[PDB]
Design an enzyme around this catalytic site. Structure first.
Site, PDB file in Angstrom:
ATOM      1  N   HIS A 247       0.824  -1.199   0.000  1.00  0.00           N
ATOM      2  CA  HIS A 247       0.000   0.000   0.000  1.00  0.00           C
ATOM      3  C   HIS A 247       0.864   1.256   0.000  1.00  0.00           C
ATOM      4  O   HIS A 247       2.013   1.253   0.449  1.00  0.00           O
ATOM      5  CB  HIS A 247      -0.933   0.007   1.211  1.00  0.00           C
ATOM      6  CG  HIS A 247      -2.100   0.934   1.066  1.00  0.00           C
ATOM      7  ND1 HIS A 247      -3.003   0.836   0.030  1.00  0.00           N
ATOM      8  CD2 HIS A 247      -2.510   1.979   1.825  1.00  0.00           C
ATOM      9  CE1 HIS A 247      -3.920   1.779   0.157  1.00  0.00           C
ATOM     10  NE2 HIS A 247      -3.643   2.486   1.238  1.00  0.00           N
ATOM     11  N   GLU A 300      12.116   0.520   1.078  1.00  0.00           N
ATOM     12  CA  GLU A 300      13.034  -0.529   1.499  1.00  0.00           C
ATOM     13  C   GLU A 300      13.508  -1.391   0.336  1.00  0.00           C
ATOM     14  O   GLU A 300      14.539  -2.060   0.460  1.00  0.00           O
ATOM     15  CB  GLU A 300      12.366  -1.403   2.561  1.00  0.00           C
ATOM     16  CG  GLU A 300      11.999  -0.654   3.838  1.00  0.00           C
ATOM     17  CD  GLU A 300      10.654   0.048   3.755  1.00  0.00           C
ATOM     18  OE1 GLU A 300      10.195   0.344   2.632  1.00  0.00           O
ATOM     19  OE2 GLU A 300      10.056   0.309   4.820  1.00  0.00           O
TER      20      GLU A 300
END
EC number: 2.3.3.16
Lengths: 370, 370
Positions: A247, A300
């Site tokens: 998301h 990330e």
């Protein structure tokens, strides 16, 4: 008394800060009003960004670290730096924050922060090699360059640029679990070494977020097979999830995620071409199965690509994220010092009512002394 | 954006525990419904009160500690145990809290708690004496009795009762700064060793409260000078403050302060008569000068008297308060594990607006590369 709440201080306001503003609705992140994309484009090193967040202006950068070998060898780099920091207070004579002025606290924070970087480099290099000579380390000029030399001995200049870019992008991102812990400890008046050590413990948690993703095995499957689209379908059709995508966090593409990708192409990362193909394939398939949800790349994902390019092992990546975040931790600790308010919430008892000791299960098994 | 709030989460409700209830309007303290003052009356040892708080019932007491000499010698007892606990996870192979069941989590907590007591005893004894033989330690039956033997060699049985009474009264007192820190760290999923280490850092702060008061020099002056009122009046008239008296915490009398004063009288503490005489003189003079305020004796006053009777030095007293509180920390760590909710508040930005790097003062002394 229950008052029908939701637990966890979810959405509650506790502080007003002047440090940094993550503008999720506008898609930008600013340190003291300065955008990250401006800082990286102008080649500003991590040592000076540390002063900007803490002081509010440039001028007094991070000093060189001083000769002091690491005394903790536990096999876990997080444990080595967490315990090493706490031991600095007796030898260096750190007083409680309640008994020192602002100027002394600022100097103590800078001295301990650069020492934590020195510890991580020593721990990574290991005890089965002799240490890097001090005269070689002193040849370099920036704090980031010293860290790579103390670790690798003869580092690649391109790898130093990659590390310095990652640390800037991770210096400060608002109020999170580890930042909250540092402020809570500091509010009790303890010395700065204790607060930094406690924050590292919170950072080690899996649910903290922001740690580089486990996409390294996934990028290896695509490398052998030669088709990125086939592997993404295979992982999704056997009931697993995709590492590094989910998301949205900002309105759109994370500013941190965009600058890291730009750095990978600019410096010529060998694994760049495969990484781009995976991102395109993953977003196409994820958005195709749920055309209603906002799906975007996690920051990330590109952090793992950059750190691998600089020869960071997987078991060392969480430590690198800790090194950069020291700038935000120190800035918030100093702000909390000037506030002078203790943090203490409340709780509501919903347990059992009064009873005698003999009415509890197991009383027959206890022995009382005469 | 700010709407006239109070900072510091003062009075906010967060958890709704079932562990213990500080009844500040009724003047009583209960662990799982059982009154604190019944437990001491029937000689319940610390090892069983640990089980009551964590498990909700008796049945599984605290086990003996395994041989493990202290590896840290820093000169500060607080630092020795804070760093030592964090180093336990690699050698014993502790896993994150997110990856273990409840049964494993409790056993790990109990194993670490008794080891923390062992470290404190070893640190207090010092490096200038040989260690106590293991066979001598094994002759004792309770955890409290072994702690005193590992430290003092041949402890007096009356001194063991005094410590075992103090630890029960200090096991758990609700949601304070140190207990809050442990729950926040555990909510991230980190291992139990990291959570306990973080709580010790928050305990060391002067503003946390509960550490024994520095009343020993005052009690020395009264012993040689005869009366108590004149000594109390002299301190007040020359601008000093009285150690151990202040604003009330409970309704009228702190029950913990009552049980400690009773324990000092049963066991024949030598300083009892001088101590109780100073308390009466102190309250009388303070209440006549400020007749509009509710003034009561602090629990820290009688805690210092009891610990001094047990041959505890002043600089070691804060560590003794940490030893007792490990019962409450472990109970709240386990409860937070079952809740499964991350703790994360929010903050409001009131800092500067967008600006260029060149518009910041001190820009002229930043060095960048081509």
């Amino acid at each position: 008394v229950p008052e029908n709440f939701v637990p966890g201080l979810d959405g509650v306001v506790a502080f007003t800060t002047e440090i940094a503003e993550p503008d999720k609705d506008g898609g930008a992140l600013r340190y003291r009003g300065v955008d990250i994309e401006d800082l990286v484009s102008q080649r500003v090193t991590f040592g000076d960004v540390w002063a900007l967040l803490v002081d509010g202006n440039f001028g007094s950068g991070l000093p060189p670290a001083e000769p002091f070998p690491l005394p903790i060898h536990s096999g876990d780099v997080r444990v080595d730096v967490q315990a090493g920091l706490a031991m600095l207070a007796p030898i260096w004579g750190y007083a409680p924050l309640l008994d020192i002025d602002d100027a002394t606290a600022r100097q103590q924070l800078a001295r301990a922060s650069v020492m934590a970087l020195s510890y991580v480099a020593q721990s990574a290099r290991g005890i089965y090699q002799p240490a890097v000579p001090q005269r070689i380390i002193d040849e370099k000029s920036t704090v980031t360059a010293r860290f790579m030399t103390r670790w690798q001995g003869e580092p690649d200049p391109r790898h130093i640029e990659a590390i310095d870019a990652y640390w800037v992008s991770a210096a400060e991102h608002g109020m999170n679990a580890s930042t909250f812990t540092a402020r809570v400890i500091a509010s009790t008046g303890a010395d700065v070494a204790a607060a930094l050590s406690g924050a590292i413990g919170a950072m080690s948690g899996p649910l903290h977020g922001g740690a580089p993703a486990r996409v390294l095995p996934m990028l290896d499957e695509v490398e052998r097979a030669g088709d990125a689209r086939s592997v993404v379908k295979g992982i999704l059709d056997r009931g697993e999830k995709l590492m590094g995508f989910g998301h949205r966090v900002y309105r759109a593409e994370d500013p941190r995620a965009r600058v890291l990708r730009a750095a990978a192409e600019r410096l010529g990362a060998p694994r760049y071409e495969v990484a781009v193909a995976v991102e395109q394939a993953a977003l196409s398939e994820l958005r195709e199965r749920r055309p209603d949800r906002a799906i975007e790349t996690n920051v990330e994902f590109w952090a793992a690509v950059v750190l691998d390019f600089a020869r960071v092992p997987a078991n060392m990546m969480p430590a690198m994220f800790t090194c950069g975040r020291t700038a935000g931790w120190c800035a918030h600790i100093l702000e909390q010092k000037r506030l002078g308010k203790l943090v203490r919430p409340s709780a509501i008892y919903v347990g059992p009512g009064p009873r005698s000791p003999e009415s509890v299960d197991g009383w027959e098994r206890v022995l009382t002394t005469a």
